[PDB]
Amino acid sequence: GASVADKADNAFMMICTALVLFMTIPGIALFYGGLIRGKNVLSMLTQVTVTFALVCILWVVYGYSLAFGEGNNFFGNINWLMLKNIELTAVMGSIYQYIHVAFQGSFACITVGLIVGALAERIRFSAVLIFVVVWLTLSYIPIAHMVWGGGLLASHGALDFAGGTVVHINAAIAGLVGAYLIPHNLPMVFTGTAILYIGWFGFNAGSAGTANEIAALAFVNTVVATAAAILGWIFGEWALRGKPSLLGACSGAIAGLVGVTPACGYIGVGGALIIGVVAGLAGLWGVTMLDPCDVFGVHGVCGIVGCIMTGIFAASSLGGVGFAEGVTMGHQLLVQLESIAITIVWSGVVAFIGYKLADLTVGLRV
Amino acid sequence: GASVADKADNAFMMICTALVLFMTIPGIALFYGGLIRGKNVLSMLTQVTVTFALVCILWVVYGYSLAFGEGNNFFGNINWLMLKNIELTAVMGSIYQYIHVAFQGSFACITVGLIVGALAERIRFSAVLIFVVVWLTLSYIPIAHMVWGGGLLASHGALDFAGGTVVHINAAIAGLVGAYLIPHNLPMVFTGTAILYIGWFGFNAGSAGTANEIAALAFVNTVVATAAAILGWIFGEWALRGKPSLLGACSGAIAGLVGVTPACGYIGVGGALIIGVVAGLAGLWGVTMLCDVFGVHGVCGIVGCIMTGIFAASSLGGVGFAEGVTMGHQLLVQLESIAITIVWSGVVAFIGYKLADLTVGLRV
Amino acid sequence: GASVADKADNAFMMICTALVLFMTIPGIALFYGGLIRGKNVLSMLTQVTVTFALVCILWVVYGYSLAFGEGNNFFGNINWLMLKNIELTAVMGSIYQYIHVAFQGSFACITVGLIVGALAERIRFSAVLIFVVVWLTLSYIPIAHMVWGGGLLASHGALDFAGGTVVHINAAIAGLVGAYLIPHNLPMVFTGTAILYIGWFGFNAGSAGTANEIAALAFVNTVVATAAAILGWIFGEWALRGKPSLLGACSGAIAGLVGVTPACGYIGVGGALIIGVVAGLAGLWGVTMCDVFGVHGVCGIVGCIMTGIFAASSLGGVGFAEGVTMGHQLLVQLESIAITIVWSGVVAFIGYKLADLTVGLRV
């Protein structure tokens, strides 16, 4: 018979949605606001706000359909615009589907906000807008379809709870391609980081789709992995430089959050402590190797770390929820690696195409 | 049988309530804080905090009762002070009534915060406090009764989901009457605007009273109408001045949110995109013509109340008018509701300011 | 049969938890950030962030178990580390127990954040870290066990809904002992205060454990008591100094919130108005006589006392337990306050000293 929405789940997920919107408006905007040069802040805030608005529109017009509708292994469909095929009472899992639409839309928003906040007043605004349309449509959307919309990576049992590939790796490589082709308020950075943290609970727990024990797990693991990464990074920084800094504390937080994103509803809390530690160190490594586009280093490295570790610590003998029936750790790690690899290439190529199309049309300079 | 509270609804509504309190403390305070002259900030923040407190007290003493209790077409009652007739387990709709008390009390708070943040250190504080008491009691309270408490406008089938009349038009007119009778931190304005946005999800979806498909519709329409307005305003501003600004982006956001407030749980998402666009442009128009903040709440409030009477129609993607109601009749009711709201609040604001003027005077 | 989690309660309590984490990160950090000297902000924010992280780790390792597991009247146990005895589906009250772990963990975090934000760049960081480990383990944890974990004060029917003893008095005394042994952005203070306020709805209503009428009561009483304290303080300050200030408005808010913390799900809304007024004035008195600790301490004591009066049904509260008189209940409230003060005074002393003798408390 018909799916019926559970009101507790509706409630949960609307609030989670509002918490993820919070992480863009104003979370990410304040994070970049205190990182970039003061002469550029007003214009950065405006470009995050405007592209946020743009993403919201594109999402309901066609983006939700092309990401989550029936299609092939790579794309959904645009058979219906503006949510027209979706009755107001339609249910997806245990919530009204409209709530699923907003929740997933808020994901596209933070993902784009991440990129846009770094590239603002480096590439011309015109060129950001063309990049956003191209890359959302042809990278974000299909990669979401592949991982969460029944496409290719989902059909091979890829594990990515809340978006190590779809959000983090995806965006990291778009930013780095953009960076290749080209701090004044630290309390403001702390504030953004803090907002990003609180919001991420909606991100990570809400990705369970219901207020059940998987969301609880995801919640607890977020707390733990973030804390362990803060300490991971901070100890690494004390060692490497003799003093620990506020920006190091914040970066570590971000590193654990990223690292735990793919893993959070699949692993045990011991797992999460380990993932956090490693992610915190790997992120300190990443930036040290490599300019606000260091942010992409952390999303990228820690995204890869977290997608790998999900394939280990999901195992029931390590405290995780368990692999799917008949799956071995070695097989699963192979699928995690293939998923990472495909995500990197796909987004590299699409980012390239988007930037060039912008360059040849309006140019990338100010 | 007895009404039974649904715990999911309770949960939803307590979180929505906290989100709407958020939009006053600190949302609206930070929004005005970066708009007004620096020499006036500390005193503005204090007055918003104090009057917020005052509203909370008046609300539980008599305000909730006079707004939502059985009365007239215009007022409820004050038969019981301090929620005394309300058992702890009493249920209103699908939630404990105490939650309905806090939710609606947070609405009075943001409404007043709106007015107070603009009038701080223009009219003396004494006079703000007299104005607040008079106008909350005699404008906010009866207009809420008329629209959401079974009074006059609700009995004619007026559509106003979350307060285009009650909050926006009502407050716009009080502010403008106050303005007639008399920008240093733009990142702070962004922050306030952002908090106002996040909170507004509690405002708008919470006005459904339950975590159902109407709250979901309200949620999605808020996302969409805000985004469309941001763009609406921003494209208008690029045209009119050659450059788009951060303050324009934020104003657009506010315009869509105001515009979608009355409409949000009655219209379809296509409707919401249209409303947002128009509300964004109408708000850019409003300020350009011209406490500009009141221009936007007022013009966009009127825009949204009108458009609710169109796009609520099933053939336009809305939830549908009540049985036997035509679009033309419904538009007529929307207009009557707007008209009555403007006069009622204009007259009561006048009375409140004068009473303050004649008692303490309206400066230093 | 087995306890089954109610999903609405899960949802409610995960959100409440996030709201309490919010009060530390960034709430308390911004509150202290605008109070302390500018030269010290960056380092204060770092120390709050790091000790927050530390508390989260210690909590899941052993702290939750030692606070809420079966033990004696004072401590739980550490029979299992890292939540190992807790199945993912285990239920505590009407929620998954993992949610209870996070909710109570976020309490330990704000309690510590309160202390750490005041002592940062006064006492060396080394010494803060030793103090935190000692005092969380030996003061926060057993006092939570005693009040909410079935220990001594709970078995005598002590009333403390959301932590007038456990959080406020406990932390006040640790801070004052620390202060004895040793404002540049007022809008930032307002912001922190506002975040602390919003977060406190999760603190206070969430302490009911479920989205029911007790959480509703707790919610409403938080609105009302905070408002009444704002006014209480502000009228007191106008009188005492001729002008009311933004910092006074914020301090009053904090005073009503502290005051109403123990009382909030036991008293009626008339009770809450009175508690707020008194707490606002008692806090203005306290500071007038690390002033932050004065307010948490006085208003914590005020609230724990008033809980024992206004919980009475004849005053609009939910009622004392069967056979309990107001006089008996006040006696218990006093005994609880007294024990909390001495216990945390003694443990704070031990912690600071151990730090002093190991690293300095200076530089």
Ligand SMILES: CCCCCCCCC/C=C\CCCCCCC(=O)OC[C@@H](COP(=O)(O)OC[C@H](O)CO)OC(=O)CCCC/C=C/CCCCCCCCC
């Ligand atoms: C300030 C310096 C001086 C001190 C003043 C203190 C402040 C005033 C408050 C003082 C006392 C509270 C009143 C007593 C109630 C407490 C007992 C209580 O809980 O309730 C008392 C009851 C009467 O007994 P009951 O229980 O029915 O019989 C039981 C049984 O049936 C038997 O048969 O009702 C009232 O007294 C309600 C009185 C309402 C007062 C109006 C206030 C504001 C109106 C609008 C205007 C808004 C406010 C304007 C003024 C601030």
